[PDB]
Amino acid sequence: QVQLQESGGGLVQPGGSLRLSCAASGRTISRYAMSWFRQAPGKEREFVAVARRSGDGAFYADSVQGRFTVSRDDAKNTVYLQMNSLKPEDTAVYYCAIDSDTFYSGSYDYWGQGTQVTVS
Amino acid sequence: EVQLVESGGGLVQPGGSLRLSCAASGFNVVDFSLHWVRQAPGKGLEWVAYISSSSGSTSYADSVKGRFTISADTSKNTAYLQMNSLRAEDTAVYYCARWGYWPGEPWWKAFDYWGQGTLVTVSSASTKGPSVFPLAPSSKSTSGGTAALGCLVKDYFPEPVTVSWNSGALTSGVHTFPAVLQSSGLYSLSSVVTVPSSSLGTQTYICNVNHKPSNTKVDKKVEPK
Amino acid sequence: DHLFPPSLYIFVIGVGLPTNCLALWAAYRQVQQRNELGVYLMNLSIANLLYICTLPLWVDYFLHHDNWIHGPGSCKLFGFIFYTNIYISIAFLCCISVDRYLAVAHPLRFARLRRVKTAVAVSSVVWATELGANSAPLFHDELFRDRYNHTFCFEKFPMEGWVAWMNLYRVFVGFLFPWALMLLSYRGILRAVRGARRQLADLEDNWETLNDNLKVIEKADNAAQVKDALTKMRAAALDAQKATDFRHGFDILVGQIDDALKLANEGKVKEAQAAAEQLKTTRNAYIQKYLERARSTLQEKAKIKRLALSLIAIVLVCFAPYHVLLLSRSAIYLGRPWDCGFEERVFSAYHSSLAFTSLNCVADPILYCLVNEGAR
Amino acid sequence: DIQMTQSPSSLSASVGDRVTITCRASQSVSSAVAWYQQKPGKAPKLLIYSASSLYSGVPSRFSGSRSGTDFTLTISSLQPEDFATYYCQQYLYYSLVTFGQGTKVEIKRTVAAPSVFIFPPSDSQLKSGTASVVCLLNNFYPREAKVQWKVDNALQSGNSQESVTEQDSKDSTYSLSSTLTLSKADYEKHKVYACEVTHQGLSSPVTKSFNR
Ligand SMILES: CCc1nn2c(C)cc(C)nc2c1Cc1ccc(-c2nnc(C3CCNCC3)o2)cc1
């Protein structure tokens, strides 16, 4: 049951924002966690932000601290990423993955297709 | 202020017997009711027994009926709890509580005062000393960044063992893990130190351990092979 | 339309005479029986009789004559009484409403407000203030000749003068204030009574729980049922104590429940039943009194609620159209007077409204029956 | 007996946050619920009695409420000393006393992926038997990791124990160990040994392996 889709992409010049939305129809989004990943000029996948169940909270990384915000938005099963400030170093192809285990072990099974964001 | 001191015992054998004593200071046992609360290792709190010296009524929990007996002595102002037919599920820390009577506020305050705690260990083991083994660094892997070493400790019955590195001079990057009660008794512990790779071949590292209830004091080196 | 005034004022000069005197006598029985509404009813009845006694000359002139057959300067002395009647009526209804709301809501503030002399002083101040307010056009006969016609006094279709502001002030202060005051009073009364019902609900439920558990323990085949029911007895007793000398009875009841709990806990059956029988006497000799007291207390607040609502309804039906039309006429004049068609349409409407609002006379006696009865 | 259930088993919060903890009864008790606080190696301390009523001596930030078989504990701000365990108890009658499960409050920070190490058995244990091999996880947040040992591309069950350190005061990170202890015969029987870890901060699971 792979339903992950990404809605975003642009060439935003320094400053500005680019809202990102992961839409899924697996109907189990209300049971486990999301995760955001990015591929940088260095050919390696890096972790951006994670949203767990309701009330469990959201955890960020050292490159998005106070600049990226992840929102559950369980109304339409779409998880949101807001990027307040962008710089040339943030150019990266973005991917969206789901958390399988209910105790947050982190065995990532399903994945996404990816979108490119050529900021600055 | 009033204080409840628990003077009981430790290290009884399976099927043995024990007797705890909850001395009270300040207040009079003829005015209050004395309970018992115990906490298992890394678990929640449970209720044990209850007495009323004035009225004489006594109540017990499900698991401690027929094996435990509680008697409060007015002359000595001390409660008691006799333990018989002890099994290994009773290994815990035992607390002695304090609860008032029904007229007025005293009943609505609940367990306003506790004791300190007494530790009971039901085991069929004996005194033993540890054995220390090295954890050699990997030359092929984990090279170029930071390398880690360690000093293993195994097969000691009494819980307290203390581990230090370089005679207590190196204190950056040392992780010592809690003891684990493996099958057939005894325990196990491990430690690790993290140092830069270039320093591996220049300065040596010695792990110093010692067991108090057995006087072992065994030392081993972790030089690379 | 020469039918509406004759017939309606015939009804007022009729059914008004014998109801008002009976109301006078009844609330006199009330004032001698240490109550505070009777003085206000005295003042109301006096003003009522005065106005109805002013009516017959009016009901005389219109029926056969058409040009004022008494003195041309005599009709001047028959508008002051009408205005005073209407506005003392609204004032006294408002006073009764606010006093009853204060009594039902805050007994502590109602203390020293239940003194009859305080009510008499308030009524005297109201009478003096209304006399001062209505002494405006008696002093200056020129102000009378402002808008009263040369004869058949019906105001003036050329409403020229400070009338456009006099009547605007009348429709604002004189109607809009007491209506809002009594609206707020009714709202407060409703909130208090609803809260009281919500409070009594759980106490009734707690009594039900206690009685059901007593019935269960009356048989008590084994010793597990006794403890199982006594636990719920304890919880219900504590909740009932929280909801509210009766606290002493609840203390005794909880103590005896604990006694039964212990006796059934040692491993017996009959002694718990003996304690259960002992529980009955303190059950039905301590708490039932306060329960009955609360049951009886609720109904008086219900009475007060419907009294306030009736007062609001009366003050709506009696006076709204006339003051609304006066505001409309003043507002029309204050703008462009080239459109006299509004006045052509609202001429008979405004006369009809001002003649209609005379039924305070006939509705005021009927409110006495919603409190202690006897006048009618 | 009357049961009591606590909603959050663990809670990751930072300083200045606001925290709520709920405990639920089972038989519609009266205002007879008390809240305690226990720190590592200490007796519990009373905070609230009779549903919501502050104790004689206690900071005023703690609060409580009752809504009918529903009890809540709140803290306006988490001072650095308010990181401990909390409990709920009902005391309707002397023989009817039950406790909650307990809630632990910790610190929150940025995700860090674990670093994995391995260590082959030493000569002495191979001499005297019961060889031991240790895989280690170093400096990772949060405390959600799984270690599954692998020999000859085959997973294991049993003969494994684990332990985790508390948060280190310097940077609020953890550490974990898993010791695979086997008899000499089956240890020299097989050839390959490998270790596997999983964490939310890693994209693909990482492995460390050694050879005899
Ligand atoms: C001042 C208002 C007023 N005061 N008042 C009093 C104190 C008692 C009673 C019972 N009614 C009244 C009214 C009402 C009221 C109603 C109709 C009129 C009116 N307009 N044209 C007429 C014709 C004109 C031709 N000749 C006959 C009369 O009569 C005036 C007034």
CB atoms near residue C341 (< 10 Å) = 9
Q: Is residue C55 lining ligand 1, measured as CB closer than 6 Å?
A: yes
CA A66 / ligand 1 centre spacing (Å): 81
The interface residues of chain B toward chain D in range 118-137, judged by CB-CB distance below 8 A, are 131, 133-136
Token pair in block for residue D99: 């406790």
DSSP one-letter code for A32: S
Q: What share of chain B is helix, strand, coil (3-state, %, to 5)?
A: 5, 40, 55
Q: Can you tell me the distance from the alpha carbon of A73 to that of C51, in angstroms, rounded to the nearest whole number? A: 72
Q: Coil, strand or helix: which one is B135?
A: coil
Contact with chain B for residue C251, Cβ under 8 A = yes
> Atom 24, ligand 1: which residue's CA is nearest?
C152
Check: CB of residue D209 under 8 Å from CB of residue D149.
no
* D85 shares a domain with D65: yes
Q: Which site among D29, D87, D94 would you substitute to test the B interface, given the most B Cβ atoms closer than 10 Å to its Cβ? A: D94
Token pair in block for residue D98: 């039950």
Q: Can you tell me the distance from the alpha carbon of B181 to that of B200, in angstroms, rounded to the nearest whole number? A: 34
Resolution of the determined structure in angstroms stands at 3.2
Check: CB of residue A29 under 8 Å from CB of residue A77.
yes
CB hemisphere CA count around C49 (13 angstroms): 13
Please report the atom of ligand 1 found closest to the CA of residue C155: 1
Q: Can you tell me the distance from the alpha carbon of C7 to that of C3, in angstroms, rounded to the nearest whole number? A: 6
CA C61 / ligand 1 centre spacing (Å): 10
Phi and psi, residue D32, nearest 5°: -130, 50
C235: left (phi over 0), alpha (psi -120 to 50) or beta: alpha
Q: Which distant-in-sequence residues (6+ apart) come within 8 Å of A89 by Cβ?
A: A40
Q: Can you tell me the distance from the alpha carbon of D79 to that of D15, in angstroms, rounded to the nearest whole number? A: 6
Secondary structure (H, E, C), chain C? CCCHHHHHHHHHHHHHHHHHHHHHHHHHHHHHCCCCHHHHHHHHHHHHHHHHHHHHHHHHHHHHCCCCCCCCCCHHHHCHHHHHHHHHHHHHHHHHHHHHHHHHHCHHHHCCCCCHHHHHHHHHHHHHHHHHHHCHHHHCHHHHCCCCCCCCCCCCCCCCCCHHHHHHHHHHHHHHHHHHHHHHHHHHHHHHHHHHHHHHHHHHHHHHHHHHHHHHHHHCCCHHHHHHHHHHHHHHHHHHHHHCCHHHHHHHHHHHHHHHHHHHHCCCCHHHHHHHHHHHHHHHHHHHHHHHHHHHHHHHHHHHHHHHHHHHHHHHHHHHHHHHHHHHHHHHHHCCCCCCHHHHHHHHHHHHHHHHCCCHHHHHHHHHHHCCCCCC
* D199 shares a domain with D120: yes
Q: Which distant-in-sequence residues (6+ apart) come within 8 Å of C371 by Cβ?
A: C37, C307
Write the single-letter amino acid at B95: Y
For the domain covering C198-294, report its CATH number: 1.20.120.10
Chain D residue at shortest CA distance from B51 = D94
Note the Cα B212 to chain centre separation in Å: 16
Could you tell me which residues are beta bridge partners of residue D35?
Answer: D48, D88
Note the Cα A103 to chain centre separation in Å: 20
Q: Can you tell me the distance from the alpha carbon of B99 to that of C110, in angstroms, rounded to the nearest whole number? A: 45
CB atoms near residue C142 (< 10 Å) = 8
**Rg of chain D over all Cα atoms, to the nearest angstrom:** 23
Q: Can you tell me the distance from the alpha carbon of D61 to that of A111, in angstroms, rounded to the nearest whole number? A: 45
With contacts defined as CB-CB under 8 Å, which chain D residues touch A65? 110
Angle (deg, nearest 10), helices C341-356 and C288-334: 150
Note the Cα C254 to chain centre separation in Å: 44
Could you tell me which residues are beta bridge partners of residue D150?
Answer: D155, D194
Look at residues D83, D109, D135 and tell me which one is the last residue of a structural domain: D109
Q: Can you tell me the distance from the alpha carbon of D196 to that of D137, in angstroms, rounded to the nearest whole number? A: 10
B86: left (phi over 0), alpha (psi -120 to 50) or beta: beta
Q: Is residue C82 lining ligand 1, measured as CB closer than 6 Å?
A: yes
Angle (deg, nearest 10), helices C80-105 and C116-134: 150
Q: Which distant-in-sequence residues (6+ apart) come within 8 Å of D158 by Cβ?
A: none
- CA-to-CA separations, D177 to A45, B57, B97, B196, C361, in angstroms, rounded: 27, 51, 38, 21, 96
Longest Cα separation, chain B: 76
Number of domains in chain D: 2
Q: Can you tell me the distance from the alpha carbon of C77 to that of C134, in angstroms, rounded to the nearest whole number? A: 12
Check: CB of residue C150 under 8 Å from CB of residue C158.
no
Task: Please report, for chain B, the start and end positions of each structural domain, with discontinuous segments joined by +.
Answer: 4-120, 131-221
C287: left (phi over 0), alpha (psi -120 to 50) or beta: alpha
Check: CB of residue C366 under 8 Å from CB of residue C24.
no
DSSP one-letter code for B137: P
Please report the beta strands in chain B, taking only residues with DSSP state E, as ranges in sequence order. 4-6, 17-24, 34-39, 45-51, 58-60, 68-70, 78-84, 92-96, 118-120, 131-134, 146-154, 161-165, 174-176, 188-196, 206-211, 219-221
Q: Is B163 exposed, middle or buried (0-12, 13-18, 19+ CB in 10 A)?
A: middle
Contact with chain D for residue C261, Cβ under 8 A = yes
Phi and psi, residue B73, nearest 5°: -100, 115
Q: Can you tell me the distance from the alpha carbon of B48 to that of B38, in angstroms, rounded to the nearest whole number? A: 7
Token pair in block for residue B14: 């399976």
Q: Coil, strand or helix: which one is B147?
A: strand
C173: left (phi over 0), alpha (psi -120 to 50) or beta: beta
Contact with chain A for residue D202, Cβ under 8 A = yes
Contact with chain B for residue C124, Cβ under 8 A = no
Q: Can you tell me the distance from the alpha carbon of C30 to that of C41, in angstroms, rounded to the nearest whole number? A: 10
Q: Can you tell me the distance from the alpha carbon of D177 to that of D127, in angstroms, rounded to the nearest whole number? A: 24
Q: With an 8 Å Cβ cutoff, are A37 and D200 in contact?
A: no
Q: Is residue C355 lining ligand 1, measured as CB closer than 6 Å?
A: yes
* D88 shares a domain with D9: yes
Q: With an 8 Å Cβ cutoff, are C242 and D93 in contact?
A: no
In CATH terms, the fold of domain A3-119 is Immunoglobulin-like (2.60.40)
Smallest Cβ–Cβ distance between B177 and the set D124, D138, D165 belongs to: D165
Domain C4-196+307-370 CATH (choose: 1.10.3720.10, 1.20.1070.10, 2.60.120.560, 1.10.10.1100): 1.20.1070.10
Write the single-letter amino acid at B154: K
Contact with chain D for residue B108, Cβ under 8 A = yes
B72: left (phi over 0), alpha (psi -120 to 50) or beta: beta
Note the Cα C57 to chain centre separation in Å: 34
Secondary structure (H, E, C), D150-205? EECCEECCCCEEEEECCCCCCCCCCEEEEEEEECHHHHHHCCEEEEEEECCCCCCC
DSSP one-letter code for D50: S
Smallest Cβ–Cβ distance between D110 and the set A55, A62, A108 belongs to: A62
Token pair in block for residue B7: 């003077």
Q: Can you tell me the distance from the alpha carbon of C247 to that of C97, in angstroms, rounded to the nearest whole number? A: 36
- Report, at the CATH architecture level, how domain B131-221 is classified: Sandwich (2.60)
Q: Can you tell me the distance from the alpha carbon of A84 to that of C352, in angstroms, rounded to the nearest whole number? A: 71
Chain B residue at shortest CA distance from D99 = B45
Task: Please report, for chain A, the start and end positions of each structural domain, with discontinuous segments joined by +.
Answer: 3-119
D160 lies in which domain range? 110-212
CB hemisphere CA count around B187 (13 angstroms): 20
Q: Coil, strand or helix: which one is A89?
A: helix
Check: CB of residue C25 under 8 Å from CB of residue C38.
no
Longest Cα separation, chain C: 105
| Residue/partner pairs of C210-213 with CB below 8 Å, 24 or more apart | C210/C236, C210/C237, C210/C240, C210/C283
Chain B residues touching chain C at CB-CB below 8 Å: 55, 57, 59, 102-103
DSSP one-letter code for A12: P
Q: Can you tell me the distance from the alpha carbon of D134 to that of D205, in angstroms, rounded to the nearest whole number? A: 18
Q: With an 8 Å Cβ cutoff, are C255 and B102 in contact?
A: yes
Q: Is residue C277 lining ligand 1, measured as CB closer than 6 Å?
A: no
Q: With an 8 Å Cβ cutoff, are D134 and B152 in contact?
A: yes
Task: Please report, for chain C, the start and end positions of each structural domain, with discontinuous segments joined by +.
Answer: 4-196+307-370, 198-294
Closest CA to C298 of C203, C197, C191, C198: C197
Contact with chain A for residue D145, Cβ under 8 A = yes
Q: Coil, strand or helix: which one is D126?
A: helix
Token pair in block for residue B94: 């035992």
**Rg of chain C over all Cα atoms, to the nearest angstrom:** 31
Q: Coil, strand or helix: which one is B96?
A: strand
Question: Residue D125: enclosing H or E segment and its boundaries?
Answer: helix D123-128
Closest CA to C280 of C211, C221, C340, C208: C211
CB hemisphere CA count around C16 (13 angstroms): 27
The CATH homologous superfamily of the domain defined by B4-120: Immunoglobulins (2.60.40.10)
Closest CA to D40 of D105, D84, D9, D78: D84
Token pair in block for residue C308: 């306030």
End-to-end CA distance of chain B: 62
Q: Can you tell me the distance from the alpha carbon of B58 to that of B68, in angstroms, rounded to the nearest whole number? A: 11
Q: Can you tell me the distance from the alpha carbon of D71 to that of C235, in angstroms, rounded to the nearest whole number? A: 17
Q: Which residue has the tokens 């991917």?
A: A95
Q: Coil, strand or helix: which one is B8?
A: coil
Check: CB of residue D121 under 8 Å from CB of residue D131.
yes
* D177 shares a domain with D98: no
Question: Residue D124: enclosing H or E segment and its boundaries?
Answer: helix D123-128
CB atoms near residue B12 (< 10 Å) = 17
Q: Is residue C229 lining ligand 1, measured as CB closer than 6 Å?
A: no
Task: Give the strands of the sheet with B146-154, arranged side by side.
Answer: B131-134, B146-154, B188-196, B174-176
> Atom 2, ligand 1: which residue's CA is nearest?
C154
Token pair in block for residue B59: 């109540």
Closest CA to B81 of B115, B40, B48: B48
With contacts defined as CB-CB under 8 Å, which chain D residues touch B152? 122, 132, 134
Q: Which residue has the tokens 């992926």?
A: D113
Distance from CA of A104 to the nearest CA of D (A): 6
CB atoms near residue B105 (< 10 Å) = 9
Cis peptide before A88 (omega within 30 of 0): no
Pairing type for strands D103-106 and D10-12 reads: parallel
Smallest Cβ–Cβ distance between D99 and the set B44, B131, B192 belongs to: B44
DSSP one-letter code for B194: E
Chain B touches chain A, with at least 3 Cβ pairs below 8 Å, answer no
Q: Coil, strand or helix: which one is A43?
A: coil
Token pair in block for residue D172: 């609020």
Token pair in block for residue D88: 């709920």
Number of CB pairs, chain A paired with chain D, less than 8 A apart: 47
Angle (deg, nearest 10), helices C80-105 and C288-334: 150
Angle (deg, nearest 10), helices C223-243 and C246-265: 160
Chain B touches chain C, with at least 3 Cβ pairs below 8 Å, answer yes
Task: Give the strands of the sheet with D160-164, arranged side by side.
Answer: D115-119, D131-138, D175-182, D160-164
Chains that touch C (3 or more CB pairs under 8 A): B, D
Token pair in block for residue C65: 């004559």
Closest CA to C86 of C269, C249, C292, C322: C322
Please report the atom of ligand 1 found closest to the CA of residue C67: 26
Task: Give the strands of the sheet with B17-24, arranged side by side.
Answer: B4-6, B17-24, B78-84, B68-70
Q: With an 8 Å Cβ cutoff, are D198 and A59 in contact?
A: no
Q: Can you tell me the distance from the alpha carbon of A16 to that of C294, in angstroms, rounded to the nearest whole number? A: 67
Q: Which residue has the tokens 């303190």?
A: C282
Check: CB of residue A69 under 8 Å from CB of residue A79.
no
- The CATH number given to whatever domain includes residue D37 is 2.60.40.10
Chain A residues touching chain D at CB-CB below 8 Å: 33, 35, 37, 45-47, 50, 55, 57, 59-62, 65, 99, 103-108
CA C65 / ligand 1 centre spacing (Å): 12
Q: Is residue C68 lining ligand 1, measured as CB closer than 6 Å?
A: no
Q: Coil, strand or helix: which one is B89?
A: helix
* D119 shares a domain with D105: no
Q: Can you tell me the distance from the alpha carbon of D94 to that of C183, in angstroms, rounded to the nearest whole number? A: 54
